[PDB]
Symmetry: D6
């Protein structure tokens, strides 16, 4: 399953959209300047617990 497009680095948005929609017809393509947000790899086995000063769960745990 193809989930990354390293061949598109350096290419135009127009070329990137054409290639991505060929491989992933349902793609919802979002165009952002570098450094807008810090993306993160999704790990379906991982569950992060964010805890407070007393080691209680402070945010809703979710897979990723």
């Amino acid at each position: 399953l193809k989930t990354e497009w390293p061949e598109l680095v350096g290419k135009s948005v127009e070329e990137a959209k054409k290639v991505i929609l060929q491989d992933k017809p349902e793609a919802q393509i979002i165009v952002l300047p570098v450094g807008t947000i810090v993306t993160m790899e999704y790990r379906i086995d991982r569950v992060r617990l964010f805890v407070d000063k007393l080691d209680n769960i402070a945010e809703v745990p979710r897979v990723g």
Copy 2:
């Protein structure tokens, strides 16, 4: 499919681990203080394109 544990907000790490491993035996549980990183919802239909000043792809596009 259960991917979030809102019932665990306010509970201890020990209780959270017990509940999560019951629902998701393979979970790799990570314990972090609030505010360490900014997590983000994973959207399997979305592909973000991060672009440079000339609208060329600057980072490897990936699903999420």
Copy 3:
């Protein structure tokens, strides 16, 4: 009760406003670039206490 519009990811502002105002006629719609602020889920059961070096309440506690 509908409080999220995942179907609007990738659509235009114009389409998003039309859909949101159909579902939520009172919506006050605000349009911001990605990464402007870090939004956070509202949890009506939760009360965060922000404390100082001596574990005294430093900000007004509020629900959320």
Copy 4:
């Protein structure tokens, strides 16, 4: 409806928990150092749209 506790500024965590649980027996109390995260007022009428370079919706819109 009471949703804020300005009278607790300057008091201990122990006193704050006692008062909050009297007013809101279901409260899930989280204790964090000042400056950990930037909280934000929840506005049930507001819907923020976070948009990309081409004014398309980049994140799931939600009430708040």
Copy 5:
């Protein structure tokens, strides 16, 4: 005493200025994009002490 204008969320700058100057004729109105600075509630009873590694006062204490 009116110190907040929740009714103005979603309205134009022009409408906001008209309403604010009606309620507060002396208002010095400043127009900034979201996320420029992090504003903070002013609490006339509170005095924050900002301390150094040795718990000495490092900045001039002021009310707020």
Copy 6:
């Protein structure tokens, strides 16, 4: 009216509390490490309007 204590820079928390409570018996004293939050002068004549991409009011305007 005294609202600042420049004479306390360099002194201990204990000395600072004694002086502040003499001048302001109602003070709610909060002790934080330098750099925890960015405080800001309160200006009772000023009203900041935080606006979105379309120059609409995005946050509740308040005095300060």
Copy 7:
């Protein structure tokens, strides 16, 4: 000695320059958007020591 111009809040750059140069003919006036940098009060009696993990001086101490 006048070192601050609170009367200029809300006025134009043009008006501000005229007033400041009347009071301080040598002023080197710099025009920046809000939030560009975090300015800090200069205290001629204060000397900050910035220290490393072993409590050694890590940066050149200077008055301010």
Copy 8:
């Protein structure tokens, strides 16, 4: 007039205090870890104007 102590880089806090108080008996010495705040050179001729979206003065101008 001596306003900087480059000879103290690498020395202990104890040695630094002894030297600084010899040169500047009135010094109010503050000890902070590196990176706590971003200090800035004070320029007595300079006046920064921080402006809003409409080029109006948004903060009190001050010398420095």
Copy 9:
């Protein structure tokens, strides 16, 4: 060529070091808390040019 160890997520530092040194005997292993720095994928084909206001090269370009 193995350059990533996804199987180590959730395991101890001790187990991780043992596995990494088996696969990569020369590894120089560094142990940091999450969120200390933002790491980035190295792309041997890519050359980033960081430019100033006038589109001149402002930093030494390097592969990566």
Copy 10:
């Protein structure tokens, strides 16, 4: 092997691209404003382990 172009500091993007593509015909050139992201030297011998509160591996270790 040439992996850095210190001779290009101060030159135009156009000149930089010409020189880089002469030395590295496969270069994928990305043009970004200064300060967009914090780049980091790639060290093929190094493996960073990012750990959680309990010293467990929190992110996939990778060479660099």
Copy 11:
């Protein structure tokens, strides 16, 4: 040896370039908006060691 140009504060880029190139004919002049990056004084005697959780060297030490 002249390494700083305090006389140029408040002057135009054009005037600054003329003066700097007179004093330093080899200068590679870079023009950036305030707040883009945090510059730092170079100290030829200093060597910073950046260490990990176990006090091992985590980055290549360099003079400065």
Copy 12:
């Protein structure tokens, strides 16, 4: 002239100090956790001009 110690990555502070002081007897060694500050290469030919909204010099230009 040796100005960097890549051979010390992964070694202890004690070993690093011994090696650095052998090569550079005058070194003023500072020990900081990773991510405390963002260091930057010093370029003796470069002069950065930091400019304000009107392209006037806003900070003292210096070599580096």
